[PDB]
């Protein structure tokens, strides 16, 4: 996981600083370790180690556990540091599904990690008072309504609460309070009757204290998986099937967990009555849609029962496997061409196959199909079976069969995407550092205008800004800006493939 460690290092350096990213990388590479050995191995002062650990545990990046002799050990969550990159996508999806109020709520929750409901509603009101003008004030009522609406949909979840010290072992305080998680009050918001109005940044006791909230990334991952499945089935059959499967997944969201081979089955009557009335679709049309989706060779849905009219179920693991297969065939096509993608799909459909059979089934002339096969072998896109006639395993007396393993190829592609995003971040930081001189020059020449904006603002300071030598350098500035924009766009768009591969790898494990 060297690429993962490098990506986490880059993210922590760009987001938190230097003295904290070292502690984070040490925790990721060495695992759970007490505080003193961490401070000894890192080589910095104890106070910096404490500050780094506290700022990491605030954003739920690391956790602390008790062990023998009452020692506390800190373990980092590399998965959480990787999910940190998905913050823009989380904000975009919470702005799409909800209003801008929930957008600011999720933004503050991600930027602070753990906060109380009063604090987040106060911050959201203070930030939204700037959006509007003309003396209109922001009340806490609608903000609390949006917060509880996010809560009941499991998008925001209460942080693990420390048990009561008086009731649980009253006496000597333990080194760690041993925070536990309770599912009863996991999504129960507190009753806060206090309201207020946000201030407009003029620059001229807590009822919900102890109750901290955070963003439930599992709900966002489930929503992204549902959106991906809906987009896939829309590209496959039609938008009507996409709406049907969207309604089915919306019904299944509550009654199912985040990891299950099959969801709870639904009947045709409840799917019909739950479908939005905007579609002029009858019962028989829905029955035909369901029975034609069940006959799809992709197995997105399944019958799995006949009671209650049309009883149907949705295959989540099969859909994720199909999405991973589509991603792999797409990257193969874009990296080696359409003919190599044809050979890949041939060797994927046929579990085991040889060179002559590949040439016969793909109709690709010799000296070229073998070349693409060897190129895919050199990139770990497939593995040879190598069935031996004799245990000597001599090449002249054995058969070589080509076979694509989806799991290993998906892991390799995920590692490649991690290293790609790491290289993109490195290139962006290099371009920023090499041009920091022009950046400071432009910042100064623009702060000349930013200073004395209204008070003592003579017009004689507007025709001298572009008089300097910065005007021919504005072209280099624009090139740097567009390069950074494109790098960030690519880094964000690779995160979708990363999410797909990570979901495929997670849902195929048992964790026994």
């Amino acid at each position: 996981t060297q690429a993962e460690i490098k990506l986490c290092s880059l993210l922590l350096q760009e987001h938190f600083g230097e003295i904290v990213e070292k502690i984070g990388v040490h925790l990721i590479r060495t695992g759970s370790q007490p505080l003193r050995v961490i401070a000894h191995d890192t080589g910095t002062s104890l106070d910096q180690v404490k500050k780094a650990l506290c700022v990491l545990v605030q954003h739920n990046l690391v956790s602390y556990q008790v062990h023998k002799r009452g020692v506390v050990e800190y373990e980092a969550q590399c998965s959480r540091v990787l999910r940190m990159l998905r913050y823009p996508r989380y904000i975009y999806t919470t702005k799409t599904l909800y209003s801008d109020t929930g957008e600011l709520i999720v933004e503050e929750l991600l930027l602070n990690g753990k906060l109380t409901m009063s604090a987040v509603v106060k911050k959201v009101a203070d930030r939204l008072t700037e959006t509007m003008e003309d003396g209109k004030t922001m009340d806490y009522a609608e903000v609390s309504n949006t917060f509880v609406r996010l809560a009941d949909t499991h998008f925001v979840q209460r942080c693990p609460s420390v048990p009561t010290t008086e009731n649980s072992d009253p006496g000597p305080p333990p080194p760690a309070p041993t925070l536990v998680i309770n599912e009863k009050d996991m999504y129960l918001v507190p009753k806060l009757s206090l309201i207020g109005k946000g201030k407009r940044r003029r620059s001229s006791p807590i009822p919900d204290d102890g109750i901290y909230w955070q963003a439930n990334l599992d709900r966002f991952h489930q929503h992204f998986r549902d959106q991906a499945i809906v987009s896939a089935v829309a590209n496959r059959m039609d938008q009507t099937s996409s709406e049907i499967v969207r309604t089915m997944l919306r019904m299944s969201e509550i009654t199912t967990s985040s990891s299950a081979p099959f969801t709870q089955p639904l009947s045709s009557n409840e799917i019909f009555r739950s479908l939005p009335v905007g579609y002029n679709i009858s019962k028989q049309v829905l029955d035909q849609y369901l029975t034609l989706l069940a006959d799809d060779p992709l197995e997105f849905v399944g019958k799995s029962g006949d009671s209650g009219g049309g009883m149907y179920v949705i295959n989540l693991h099969k859909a994720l496997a199909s999405l991973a297969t589509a991603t792999l065939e797409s990257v193969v096509q874009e990296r080696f061409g359409s003919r190599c993608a044809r050979i890949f799909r041939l060797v994927l459909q046929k579990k085991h196959i040889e060179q002559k059979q590949v040439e016969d089934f793909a109709m690709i002339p010799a000296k070229e199909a073998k070349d693409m096969l060897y190129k895919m072998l050199s990139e770990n896109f497939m593995s040879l079976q190598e069935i031996p006639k004799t245990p000597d395993h001599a090449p002249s007396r054995t058969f070589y069969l080509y076979t694509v393993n989806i799991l290993s190829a998906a892991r390799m592609l995920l590692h490649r995407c991690y290293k790609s995003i790491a290289n993109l971040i490195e290139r962006r930081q290099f371009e920023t550092k090499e041009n920091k001189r022009l950046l400071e020059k432009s910042q100064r020449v623009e702060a000349i205008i930013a200073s004395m904006q209204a008070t003592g603002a003579e017009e004689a300071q507007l025709q001298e800004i572009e008089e300097m030598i910065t005007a021919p350098e504005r072209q280099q500035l624009e090139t740097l800006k567009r390069n950074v924009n494109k790098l960030d766009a690519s880094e964000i768009q690779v995160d979708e493939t990363i999410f797909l591969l990570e979901s495929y790898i997670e849902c195929t494990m048992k964790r026994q």
Partner: protein, 495 residues
């Protein structure tokens, strides 16, 4: 004006930290890339080719042609390495056992180590203790390997992990789809039934469907090692700063400088004398070129894998020229000297060049009895005394003696042969030039290579040594005869 930089520091080596180099570090350390399989040019001068083997940018091996990287002669050139890229990765014969061990330690699907969280914490706490020794490290590795081989299913991803063993030579087989006498799992049944097209097009696949386990070629092994989490690296008893699991599989070969590969220009015939390492590297480059040619021309998979196995075998012979599992048809015709053979043996580097090495300022002569000498004195012939010289520094005490010694010259027995000045280190031969002027200009601190005279402490030894008394330091007395003479009473120690 002038920046202060230290000229020389009395640096003393504290300890040697062994480790491994990644292919990127191999590229960074090397200066040039060797791609030409030939040695010399087509012209009659037979100059070494550029970017090929025997190139002078990687040091020099001839007294006339200097190095191209550093402008120094053969005596001052320390040598430079090169890097050769391989089309297909090959297992390192030295770390092949380590490769098998690591493959047995970690899972073959998620690359995680076969250890539960409690066992992971226990092993980490056992390893975090200070003063960990080599024996303790090897014992911990053995224990963790046993506890990993005890398990059969993965606690991280849930994939099955069968036995991993060595089949043939430099080939690894993982028994993922093992035969189950009880109710069979769905995975093995799906694997068996996935051969439908293969059986339809080739019936021979059906009888040989059994024993079809996973074959871990260097590509898949390298891909798995590149995805190993850094947290599990200390659990493999391998130092993270020393190396990484991906370094065990070699993709670049470090061709050594010309100092390790001396070349003899035998002008008596139309050929040159080269060591075995140069020929092995030439064969490896030729195999890489042949593999590339077959990949371009679209050859069959059987011959491609045969060329890959031949390249692996040639790399192993370049590393260790004495293997056991070499096939008879793939066995070498002649005998070559690999690095292992150059290291081990009675004539190796450790025993022949490190523990015991030849020195100068020494002689060997037949002995004869002489009872008229003391037991702590030994007679040295005049002829040997004129050759074995001692460097005496000119001081305020022996100035008038060294003056007369220089005046006598290298012909008279009491005298010297060379004078090294204090300011300049240019030696001066006393056989030429006015010796009187040199004697009159003997400054304090000069070195005079005086002849062996009476009173000099000299080691005297018999080469067959049983105890320490076989070699003793005596006082040299010069005699006109030609034998080493000493008191016979000291005959019993020397035997």
């Amino acid at each position: 004006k002038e920046q202060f930089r230290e000229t020389d520091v009395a640096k003393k080596i504290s300890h040697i930290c062994f480790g491994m180099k990644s292919p990127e570090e191999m590229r960074q350390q090397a200066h040039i890339q060797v791609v030409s399989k030939n040695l010399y040019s087509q012209d009659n001068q037979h100059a070494p080719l550029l970017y090929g083997v025997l190139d002078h940018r990687m040091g020099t091996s001839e007294k006339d042609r200097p190095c191209e990287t550093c402008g120094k002669n053969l005596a001052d050139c320390l040598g430079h390495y090169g890097y050769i890229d391989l089309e297909l990765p090959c297992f390192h014969v030295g770390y092949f056992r380590a490769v098998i061990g690591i493959l047995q330690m970690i899972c073959k699907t998620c690359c995680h180590i076969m250890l539960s969280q409690e066992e992971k914490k226990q092993f980490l706490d056992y390893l975090k203790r200070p003063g960990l020794t080599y024996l303790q490290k090897r014992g911990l590795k053995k224990k963790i390997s046993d506890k990993c081989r005890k398990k059969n299913i993965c606690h991280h991803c849930g994939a099955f992990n069968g036995t991993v063993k060595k089949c043939g030579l430099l080939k690894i087989i993982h028994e993922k789809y093992k035969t189950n006498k009880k109710v069979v799992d769905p995975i093995v049944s799906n694997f068996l039934q996935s051969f439908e097209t293969a059986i339809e097009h080739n019936k021979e696949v059906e009888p040989l469907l059994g024993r079809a386990q996973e074959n871990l070629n260097p590509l898949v092994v390298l891909n798995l090692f590149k995805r190993i989490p850094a947290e599990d690296v200390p659990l493999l008893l391998m130092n993270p700063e020393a190396g990484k699991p991906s370094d065990l599989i070699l993709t670049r070969l470090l061709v050594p400088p010309l100092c390790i590969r001396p070349s003899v220009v035998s002008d008596l015939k139309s050929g040159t004398n080269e060591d075995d390492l140069t020929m092995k590297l030439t064969e490896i480059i030729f195999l890489n070129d042949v593999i590339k040619k077959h990949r371009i021309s679209g050859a069959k998979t059987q011959m491609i894998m045969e060329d890959w196995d031949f390249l692996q075998l040639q790399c192993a012979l370049y590393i260790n020229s004495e293997l056991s599992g070499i096939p008879l048809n793939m066995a070498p015709k002649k005998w070559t000297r690999g690095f292992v053979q150059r290291l081990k043996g009675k004539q190796g580097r450790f025993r022949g060049n490190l523990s015991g090495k030849r020195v100068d300022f020494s002689g060997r002569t037949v002995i004869s009895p002489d009872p008229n000498l003391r037991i702590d004195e030994v007679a040295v012939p005049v002829h040997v005394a004129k050759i074995l010289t001692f460097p005496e520094k000119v001081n305020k005490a022996n100035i008038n003696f060294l003056r007369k010694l220089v005046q006598n010259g290298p012909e008279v027995h009491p005298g010297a042969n060379f004078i090294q000045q204090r300011h300049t280190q240019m030696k001066r031969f006393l056989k030429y030039g006015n010796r009187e002027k040199m004697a009159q200009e003997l400054k304090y601190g000069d070195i005079v290579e005086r002849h062996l005279i009476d009173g000099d402490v000299v080691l005297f030894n018999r080469q067959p040594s049983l105890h320490k008394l076989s070699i003793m330091a005596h006082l040299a007395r010069v005699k006109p005869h030609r034998t080493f003479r000493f008191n016979e009473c000291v005959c019993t120690p020397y035997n």
